[PDB]
Symmetry: C3
Subunit: 152 residues, 3 copies
């Protein structure tokens, strides 16, 4: 065989979908081996083990609007028994400070956030990397937005 | 039930501890297992190896001052052998290119810092995670401030 | 001494190359274990399997020039099957949201970029980790700009 036995997965955001982050393992450079499945846009964990659960999204806007743009990306985990979203890793970014553009429009900011950690998950647990602003997500990527778990 | 061995620790930082950054155990899905005591605010490694080392901090700031705020996050190894402290992972970032809220008091800034590399440790070595302006720490803390390792 | 059966690597930037990213396997903890080969400025892969590719670049400047910078970081795989560079993980950061600090000449900004994911490489597979603004690279640091793979 080739994909070893350790339950793995490296999902990439879908460039077609818009204003929504949909995870696609079915492109080049994407894995979903030995157990892991993609169900409700959430990775489901095959076996009780220890997993590293990184993820990365890449935000983009054109000029800084009024109303403070606070951006967030978080990896929550809904466990078998206690089926509620408990927050694993998270992070906020505020890419705007400015007067909110003027004498020259545009000039786009870019803002990536990365989340990585080692956590214990059981059989049937689910995970899901999500953001508060699917409008700002960016993708003429190939590797700009991703979500993955690997058993260790 | 704790399957999969290999020294492992994934520690989150203690919220109610005004500006000090004291890691803790028991919280969230914080781990220390297979002998990685967290002594004196340092993960203590048990036996040599290539350890995946990662950690994240989140600096939050309500309005920019007029003194250029630089913020560095660092993981330095204090080798059990040489006792010497060697800087492994380091990052530096500046939340604002000087604005300094003059009028219209406020507008928060969020600047996360994630560090992660693969390194060669030695049984007894100690890893330290430290920042420089701990007066800039976000106490919303779900799973925002963390430090961790795991044998590979 | 150096652990584990599995091939790994962790080269590091040369603070001598004028305007380019040159990796090295002899400074910092620049490993080149079991069959990995830092070659034409890229790691040639020893064998099949899931690898953990991670890297980090640092950027620096003082004040903002031509309204838009765009620091980018991409690790691309050039597969022995489909021989053509192909993005694996990418991030674009952009310092100076307009700004253009005329009176705050030489008032510095610091901008890092980490990233890393699991992928199923094969043998003879080459990996490049390249920036777009070597001139914006920071070099007053050690555990600053690295790039490595670890068979897992």
């Amino acid at each position: 065989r080739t994909p070893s036995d350790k339950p793995v997965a490296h999902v990439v955001a879908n460039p077609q979908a818009e204003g929504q982050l949909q995870w696609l393992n079915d492109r080049a450079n994407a894995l979903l081996a030995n157990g892991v499945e993609l169900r409700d846009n959430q990775l489901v964990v095959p076996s009780e083990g220890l997993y590293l659960i990184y993820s990365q999204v890449l935000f983009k806007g054109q000029g800084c609007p009024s109303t403070h743009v606070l951006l967030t990306h978080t990896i929550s985990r809904i466990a078998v028994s206690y089926q509620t979203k408990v927050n694993l890793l998270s992070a906020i970014k505020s890419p705007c400070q400015r007067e909110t553009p003027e004498g020259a429009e545009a000039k786009p900011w870019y803002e990536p956030i990365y989340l990585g950690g080692v956590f214990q998950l059981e059989k049937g647990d689910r995970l899901s990397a999500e953001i508060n602003r699917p409008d700002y997500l960016d993708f003429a990527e190939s590797g700009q937005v991703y979500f993955g778990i690997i058993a260790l």
